[PDB]
Design a protein around this ligand. Structure first.
Ligand SMILES: *[C@@H]1O[C@H](CO)[C@@H](O[C@@H]2O[C@H](CO)[C@@H](O[C@@H]3O[C@H](CO)[C@@H](O)[C@H](O)[C@@H]3O)[C@H](O)[C@H]2NC(C)=O)[C@H](O)[C@H]1NC(C)=O
Ligand SMILES: *[C@@H]1O[C@H](CO)[C@@H](O[C@@H]2O[C@H](CO)[C@@H](O[C@@H]3O[C@H](CO)[C@@H](O)[C@H](O)[C@@H]3O)[C@H](O)[C@H]2NC(C)=O)[C@H](O)[C@H]1NC(C)=O
Ligand SMILES: *[C@@H]1O[C@H](CO)[C@@H](O[C@@H]2O[C@H](CO)[C@@H](O[C@@H]3O[C@H](CO)[C@@H](O)[C@H](O)[C@@H]3O)[C@H](O)[C@H]2NC(C)=O)[C@H](O)[C@H]1NC(C)=O
Ligand SMILES: *[C@@H]1O[C@H](CO)[C@@H](O[C@@H]2O[C@H](CO)[C@@H](O)[C@H](O)[C@H]2NC(C)=O)[C@H](O)[C@H]1NC(C)=O
Ligand SMILES: *[C@@H]1O[C@H](CO)[C@@H](O[C@@H]2O[C@H](CO)[C@@H](O)[C@H](O)[C@H]2NC(C)=O)[C@H](O)[C@H]1NC(C)=O
Ligand SMILES: *[C@@H]1O[C@H](CO)[C@@H](O)[C@H](O)[C@H]1NC(C)=O
Ligand SMILES: *[C@@H]1O[C@H](CO)[C@@H](O)[C@H](O)[C@H]1NC(C)=O
Ligand SMILES: *[C@@H]1O[C@H](CO)[C@@H](O)[C@H](O)[C@H]1NC(C)=O
Ligand SMILES: *[C@@H]1O[C@H](CO)[C@@H](O)[C@H](O)[C@H]1NC(C)=O
Ligand SMILES: *[C@@H]1O[C@H](CO)[C@@H](O)[C@H](O)[C@H]1NC(C)=O
Ligand SMILES: *[C@@H]1O[C@H](CO)[C@@H](O)[C@H](O)[C@H]1NC(C)=O
Ligand SMILES: *[C@@H]1O[C@H](CO)[C@@H](O)[C@H](O)[C@H]1NC(C)=O
Ligand SMILES: *[C@@H]1O[C@H](CO)[C@@H](O)[C@H](O)[C@H]1NC(C)=O
Ligand SMILES: *[C@@H]1O[C@H](CO)[C@@H](O)[C@H](O)[C@H]1NC(C)=O
Ligand SMILES: *[C@@H]1O[C@H](CO)[C@@H](O)[C@H](O)[C@H]1NC(C)=O
Lengths: 380, 229, 428, 147, 49
């Protein structure tokens, strides 16, 4: 009933439909800020990296804030931002070329992109400097190669593998980060999950505005024309027809926004769970945070969402070995304490499950229980 | 005598200005790739020889185009009988002015300077005069008879562009004559040309930054056109 | 809004604001040629119903007071535009269908109805807009010997199409006999009704004129009278450009209209431009500023001071609307210097912006929160995210806990909600 | 005419019921999601010890206790929070007779004069021995090895 | 209103309703195929015993 008091007076006869629609949209608007806060505001303090960006040879320059460029965002965050900000009017900006100005107002988020970037930076500095300790109690500094050594223990790989191969691991990490940046740069569809959300909301508003042009059985869709051409007692009939059509269109908009809000809430809860378990800790849940054995994760912000970089350990270059469940020695059955017995065809060795590193089979690496007769397939 | 490849006949359907939009509208249009008759067999002096020049039906509306530099085509006659039993509309294009008349034209010049233009005009109901209309310039016209109005659209495209489908351009309305005339047939009046027929169709029309129509999709032509629409 | 005399601390959404118009602009064609209704209504003779006199009226000023001056009327029978207050509209096309009909068939002139007239002599569209205006002409058309210049086509092969007429007089054929000439039971079609001055009311002649009106905004006009005024640009006004009525801000347009074109539309089929009928200037129509209003309240158990956020607008326009007495809500706030702050969300009036950061209390948006602080007043600030804590990263330094705390935290989750059922029939 | 006025009231009441039920279905879905999370937390926090960070409260999870509440459940999560940290000098390995010694468990720390092995989450220095460490490789491979 | 031109002409006065329903049901259909693919197509190779 824009700028029409006869229509407004008729609209009042339908009861508290506006109260329910206003409250539903307000609840959605509040929920979106709750979702953003739950996903990103998980750190008690704003942590910062040291002045010297040396972490054992690991290069985080593409995920850490770039102090030179405005907004203090990482190269990857800036790429994600430039790639998905296809919304011309996603917030008021102190101000469809008309931006759906038919009583439909888009509200800004409570946390701006720079503040979200600051939360992401705090989480990244915390993870890089102190591993998972900052996510449980106070932040405890640890040298990065030692943090990685303990994460390797977390995935069942002995600490010496990292230290002996520290240069290899740092180079593979740096290469993987560069490849990720190039993949996101060269593949516009990679961020489709976030773009679809923007597109769906745009469609929801565009259709709603278009519904104003429908007649819904009236002689004319314009209230000024109805009032000009018809006397009040007939104008009220034509206006009630338009009120019914527009109100049904608003209820449809609100119902779909509530359903989409529920979907976004579920996604935000998943994002918060992933951040809590994979950024503030090391996860043992298979494929929860990337394919492979999980080592660590890094958050990056994005318009209307979060992008996680999951760093995992992937076994490579496997070799066939002959195995046995136990070794028979002096009538005793010897079992591995932490490993598998393997043979290269002439000699038996004990190795760790996730990385070939043959050891001499000794009484300090095995345990004895029972004799050689009970175990099936025991080898001398 | 029949040219199949016609993608032209789009015109501005209303007085609404649009900019940088694709607008889906339902109106009478020449369908894309509709069979269009090319009257080269019976063209000018050596075609009609003061004979033939057949009268064509007028189904909803027609598309007309001329490629004759000498302007042998001077006008059009519209009506149902054209022997004074019913009213007929004449739109002859003189070098000085275009003279549109509705009268009971029992006689006409239709059975090389100073050709006859005689007509009897036994009883007249409408008269109108407008600016003159008068190879390097192809002259497209659309003539439709809707709800008591004879709507004439045209484009004297300067296109030297001898190939008939040289490019796409939308026609602009030229005149809207308030004539309550029943039109079922028409004839081309000579002192070559193409005639196509309009059908109800839905088109997706592309309006550019200046509001000029630059392209169009015929939504019934192909599954791809339906997808685009 | 909250239906309470006690308001909790927070920001609440209230009604929206609009900038009200200050002027009324009528731009009708500068035409002084009166439409020839007098020559049609006050005619010497009307045509027979068989071939009604269809007069096209255009390029003139409509004036319907002529009709009230002409005579009291039997009926107006206005459809689509029901009132007789037609002087406020601009019509694209006007047609006057003039005929003399007998009284017992006047009721047959409705858009949908049966009888020999409705079915075979004059047919209106069932969705027709216009007025069928009747006048008693017994004193003019009736003759003592009978006026035989009128007839009806009561015998026809098929139904008459709306506003389409084939006036051939060929004798109706029936049966398998040609019926060429008189003698067979096929009779000449016209009725020959004779209007006599001694007939009762149901048989007297009536002069009926059907005014067919085409209302399509105003691509063409036959406008009624109004006193036009001058254009005022860059202000919120109520404008009427021919029959196009609306409210907005008129500015110079940068669109390139064809000479043909008069109006513009956006992607949502809303008017966004109009050609001025007296200057042919193309104008842009911008909606008058509007947006949500929210009130930031510390809570009525602390202070009755509130701040108002005008969402979606620049404080320059809010200040102008307040000074001009244009803002829709009639309440005002002090709006003094240092109490007006521009946020991304909108114009915040009634809070002093400070350069200190605090934890967010009452959220406003885009980073600005507000609170009630010291003497005490509402302040606005950029929210703090947390304390900073640089961590002493080193190549060879590790921090090891030496003590610990056993902490207990509480997490609350809903499991179920009230189970209800509704008796649909009893409720409705 | 009563038929028309009654049909308008029927339409209004029926539409109001459809609005109510649709909102109840959406709220029911929200409650179901919450109940599924509560049941998962009951299974993983109360019936066992969880290793999921911040799933069962802040800190390292020790145990949880359920309490009922109207229309819901309240969990009391008991966690271990490190406190009073001290910053020690560390090294990835100790070099002795040319062998590179790595911890089996724990981290090497130093008070500035002596090196000890300590459990990662609680300072408790131990003497570095061949029982606490393992040997792999030699002193020329590990970066930052100390004698 | 199947096979009725008159009702189609009236139905066009209610706007894009049919289009919104087509989008909603198509989105659901795609989502159901996404759900099946996400649950079962978690292995990049077809292993055999
Ligand atoms: C961490 O990695 C980034 C790259 O991922 C390093 O920045 C890169 O540094 C090299 C230095 O050679 C830059 O090379 C430049 O090449 C152009 C020609 O292509 C030349 O004109 C320049 O003078 C320079 O040699 C490279 O562009 C630059 N890339 C980026 C994205 O900054 C960074 O230095 C690494 N940090 C550490 C501590 O290793
Ligand atoms: C399975 O693994 C065992 C252990 O690695 C292999 O036996 C070992 O083979 C190496 C080959 O270089 C022997 O090295 C020897 O070093 C002395 C140093 O003086 C040199 O003089 C010899 O010529 C030779 O290079 C090593 O002694 C030997 N160890 C034993 C216990 O036999 C074995 O060959 C592997 N089998 C397969 C099928 O891979
Ligand atoms: C780093 O830790 C080591 C061992 O925890 C410290 O060395 C120890 O220092 C204590 C003094 O606080 C010595 O106690 C002394 O024991 C002798 C035993 O005869 C007694 O006579 C003295 O009166 C005193 O009680 C202890 O012996 C000594 N142990 C060793 C192996 O040196 C070291 O001082 C610590 N350094 C720093 C900087 O904290
Ligand atoms: C491992 O060694 C034992 C002997 O130390 C083998 O046991 C002998 O197996 C032979 C098989 O013919 C018997 O005849 C002997 O009497 C067994 N002796 C004893 C003491 O048990 C055993 O078979 C060897 N296993 C393998 C896999 O070679
Ligand atoms: C640990 O001790 C070894 C010797 O036991 C040191 O090795 C010597 O290092 C110096 C240079 O610092 C060389 O000039 C000698 O030739 C090396 N000798 C041997 C036998 O390797 C080693 O540098 C010591 N490491 C530290 C960190 O002090
Ligand atoms: C508000 O309007 C004034 C008009 O002069 C303009 O100068 C100013 O930049 C505008 N501010 C914003 C935030 O748009
Ligand atoms: C070695 O491993 C590969 C793994 O694909 C397998 O195909 C091959 O048959 C194996 N060979 C032996 C001798 O076990
Ligand atoms: C297609 O168009 C060309 C002109 O570009 C014409 O020469 C040719 O005959 C046409 N083909 C037909 C009519 O099938
Ligand atoms: C509109 O037409 C003019 C004609 O000179 C042209 O220069 C201008 O570029 C056109 N508009 C756009 C947006 O290209
Ligand atoms: C108008 O009608 C009156 C009769 O009511 C007649 O006397 C007068 O001459 C008429 N004037 C005209 C047709 O100009
Ligand atoms: C209709 O009546 C008017 C009255 O002035 C007359 O001028 C006009 O010619 C008439 N037309 C017909 C078709 O009778
Ligand atoms: C128009 O002309 C056609 C020619 O066949 C005729 O059948 C039709 O009845 C005519 N209609 C009118 C209103 O004259
Ligand atoms: C009347 O309007 C026309 C519109 O083109 C204008 O040219 C003419 O000057 C106007 N005359 C007056 C007296 O306003
Ligand atoms: C760690 O060692 C490298 C060796 O080049 C040095 O550049 C870096 O500054 C050291 N880190 C600190 C915190 O001193
Ligand atoms: C680390 O320990 C040194 C003494 O070894 C001390 O001077 C420094 O302040 C400590 N740093 C922190 C962050 O506790």
């Amino acid at each position: 009933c824009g700028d029409s008091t006869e229509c407004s007076n008729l609209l009042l006869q339908y009861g508290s439909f506006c109260t329910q629609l206003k409250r539903a949209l307000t609840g959605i608007a509040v929920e979106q800020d709750k979702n953003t806060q739950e996903v990103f505001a998980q750190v008690k303090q704003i942590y910062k990296t040291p002045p010297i960006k040396y972490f054992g040879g690991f290069n985080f320059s593409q995920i850490l804030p770039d102090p030179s460029k405005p907004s203090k965002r990482s190269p990857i965050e800036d790429l994600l931002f430039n790639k998905v900000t296809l919304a011309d009017a996603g917030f008021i900006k102190q101000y469809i070329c008309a931006q759906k100005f038919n009583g439909l107002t888009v509200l800004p988020p409570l946390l701006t992109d720079e503040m979200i970037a600051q939360y992401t930076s705090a989480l990244l500095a915390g993870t890089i400097t102190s591993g998972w300790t900052f996510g449980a109690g106070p932040a405890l500094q640890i040298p990065f190669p030692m943090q990685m050594a303990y994460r390797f223990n977390g995935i069942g790989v002995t600490q010496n593998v990292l230290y002996e191969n520290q240069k290899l691991i740092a180079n593979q990490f740096n290469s993987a980060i560069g490849k990720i940046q190039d993949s996101l740069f060269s593949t516009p569809s990679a961020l489709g999950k976030l773009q679809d959300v923007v597109n769906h909301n745009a469609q929801a508003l565009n259709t709603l505005v278009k519904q104003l042009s429908s007649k819904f059985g009236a002689i004319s869709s314009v209230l000024n024309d109805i009032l000009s051409r018809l006397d009040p007692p007939e104008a009220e009939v034509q206006i009630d027809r338009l009120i019914t059509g527009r109100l049904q269109s608003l209820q449809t908009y609100v119902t779909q926004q509530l359903i989409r809000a529920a979907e976004i809430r579920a996604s935000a809860n998943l994002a918060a769970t992933k951040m809590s378990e994979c950024v503030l800790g090391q996860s043992k849940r298979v494929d929860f945070c990337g394919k492979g054995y999980h080592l660590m994760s890094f958050p990056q912000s994005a318009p209307h969402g979060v992008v996680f970089l999951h760093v995992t350990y992937v076994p490579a270059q496997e070799k066939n070995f002959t195995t046995a469940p136990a070794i028979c020695h002096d009538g005793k059955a010897h079992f591995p304490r932490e490993g598998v017995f393997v043979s290269n065809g002439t000699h038996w060795f004990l190795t760790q499950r996730n990385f070939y590193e043959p050891q001499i089979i000794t009484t300090d690496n095995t345990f004895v229980s029972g004799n050689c007769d009970v175990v099936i397939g025991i080898v001398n | 005598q029949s040219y199949t490849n016609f993608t032209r006949g789009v015109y501005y359907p209303d007085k609404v200005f649009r900019s940088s939009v694709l607008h889906l509208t339902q109106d009478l249009f020449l369908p894309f790739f509709s069979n269009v008759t090319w009257f080269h067999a019976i063209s000018g002096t050596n075609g009609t020889k003061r004979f033939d020049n057949p009268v064509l039906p007028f189904n909803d509306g027609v598309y007309f185009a001329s490629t004759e530099k000498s302007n042998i085509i001077r006008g059009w006659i519209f009506g149902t009988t054209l022997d004074s039993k019913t009213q007929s509309l004449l739109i002859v294009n003189n070098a000085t002015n275009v003279f549109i008349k509705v009268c009971e034209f029992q006689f006409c010049n239709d059975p090389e300077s100073e050709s006859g233009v005689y007509s009897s005009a036994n009883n007249c109901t409408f008269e109108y005069v407008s600016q003159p209309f008068l190879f390097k310039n192809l002259r497209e016209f659309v003539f439709k008879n809707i709800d008591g109005y004879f709507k004439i659209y045209s484009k004297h495209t300067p296109i030297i562009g001898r190939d008939f489908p040289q490019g796409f351009s939308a026609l602009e309305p030229l005149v809207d004559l308030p004539i309550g005339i029943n039109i079922t047939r028409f004839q081309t009046l000579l002192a070559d040309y193409y005639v196509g027929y309009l059908q109800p169709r839905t088109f997706l029309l592309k309006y550019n930054e200046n509001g000029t129509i630059t392209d169009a999709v015929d939504c019934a032509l192909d599954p791809l056109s339906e997808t685009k629409c | 809004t909250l239906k309470s005399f006690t308001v909790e601390k927070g920001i609440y959404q209230t009604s929206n604001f609009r900038v009200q118009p200050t002027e009324s602009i009528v731009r009708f064609p500068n035409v002084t040629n009166l439409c020839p209704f007098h020559e049609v209504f006050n005619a010497t003779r009307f045509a027979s119903v068989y071939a009604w006199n269809r007069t096209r009226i255009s390029n003139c000023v409509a004036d319907y007071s002529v009709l009230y001056n002409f005579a009291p009327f039997f009926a107006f029978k206005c459809y689509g535009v029901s009132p007789t207050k037609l002087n406020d509209l601009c019509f694209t096309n006007v047609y006057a269908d003039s005929f003399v009909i007998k009284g017992n068939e006047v009721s047959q002139i409705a858009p949908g109805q049966t009888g020999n007239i409705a079915d075979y002599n004059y047919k209106l569209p069932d969705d027709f807009t216009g007025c069928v205006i009747a006048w008693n002409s017994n004193k003019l058309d009736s003759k003592h010997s009978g006026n035989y210049d009128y007839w009806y086509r009561s015998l026809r092969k098929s139904k008459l199409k709306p506003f389409e007429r084939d006036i051939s007089t060929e004798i109706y054929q029936a049966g398998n006999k040609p019926c060429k000439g008189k003698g067979p039971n096929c009779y000449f079609p016209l009725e020959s009704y004779g209007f006599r001055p001694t007939y009762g009311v149901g048989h007297q002649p009536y002069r009926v004129v059907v005014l067919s009106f085409e209302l399509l905004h105003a691509p063409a006009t036959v406008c009624g009278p109004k006193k036009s005024t001058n254009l005022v640009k860059n202000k919120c006004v109520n404008f009427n450009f021919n029959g196009l009525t609306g409210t907005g801000v008129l500015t110079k347009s940068n669109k390139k209209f064809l000479p043909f074109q008069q109006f513009g539309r956006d992607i949502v089929d809303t008017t966004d431009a109009v050609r001025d009928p007296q200057t042919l200037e193309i104008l842009d129509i911008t909606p008058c500023s509007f947006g949500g209003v929210s009130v930031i309240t510390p809570g009525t158990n602390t202070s009755n001071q509130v701040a108002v956020l005008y969402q979606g607008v620049n404080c320059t326009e809010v200040s102008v609307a307040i000074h001009a007495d244009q803002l829709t809500p009639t309440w005002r706030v002090y709006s003094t210097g240092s109490n007006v702050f521009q946020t991304r969300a909108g114009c915040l009036i009634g809070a002093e912006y400070v350069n200190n950061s605090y934890e967010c209390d009452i959220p406003i948006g885009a980073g600005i929160c507000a609170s009630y602080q010291t003497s005490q007043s509402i302040i606005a600030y950029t929210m703090s995210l947390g304390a900073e804590n640089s961590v002493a990263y080193s190549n060879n330094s590790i921090a090891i806990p030496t003590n610990f705390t056993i902490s207990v935290t509480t997490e609350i989750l809903p499991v179920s909600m009230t189970k209800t059922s509704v008796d649909c029939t009893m409720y409705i």
